Amino acid sequence: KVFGRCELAAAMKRHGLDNYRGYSLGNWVCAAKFESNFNTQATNRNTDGSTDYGILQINSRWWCNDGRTPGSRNLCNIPCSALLSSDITASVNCAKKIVSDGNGMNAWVAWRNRCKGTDVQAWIRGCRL
Ligand SMILES: [Cl-]
């Protein structure tokens, strides 16, 4: 599923991401835009052999099991394919664990490079929330 901007904002808000660990909703929407272009089916392979999955590009090196990343952990205790669902529940629940781990949203390279320090409120502007 390819979400609309406001559609995703509302789904994320419903799932408790607004101001989660101090990160306003606009941060999460911005991250999803540049990580996956709002596409729940996005996948990308990394140099080390791990793969990033879903709307928030969660990495199989640490967070999910895809059966092909030897010596990796599965800290979210889920198969990576669960992160590709049209239902964003699994992605959100895992993102909450990631953002709580000490490094905040800096875990997401696109957030650090393209959202951090910008006017992220612009990403939820006009939305019915
Ligand atoms: Cl933080």
**Structural domain boundaries, residue 120:** 1-129
Q: Which residues of 46-85 are buried (b: 16+ CB within 10 A; e: fewer)?
A: eeeebbbbbbbbbbbbbbbbbeebeebeeebebbbebbbe
Catalytic residue among 35, 48, 66, 87: 35
What does the alpha-carbon distance between residue 33 and residue 25 come to, in Å, rounded to a whole number?
13
What does the alpha-carbon distance between residue 65 and residue 62 come to, in Å, rounded to a whole number?
8
Q: Is residue 29 within 8 Å of 21, Cβ to Cβ?
A: no
Verify whether residue 52 is a known catalytic residue.
yes
Number of domains present in the structure of the chain: 1
Verify whether residue 7 is a known catalytic residue.
no
Has 18 been labeled as part of a binding site?
no
Identify the CATH number of the domain in which residue 120 sits. Answer: 1.10.530.10
Helical H runs in 15-82?
25-36
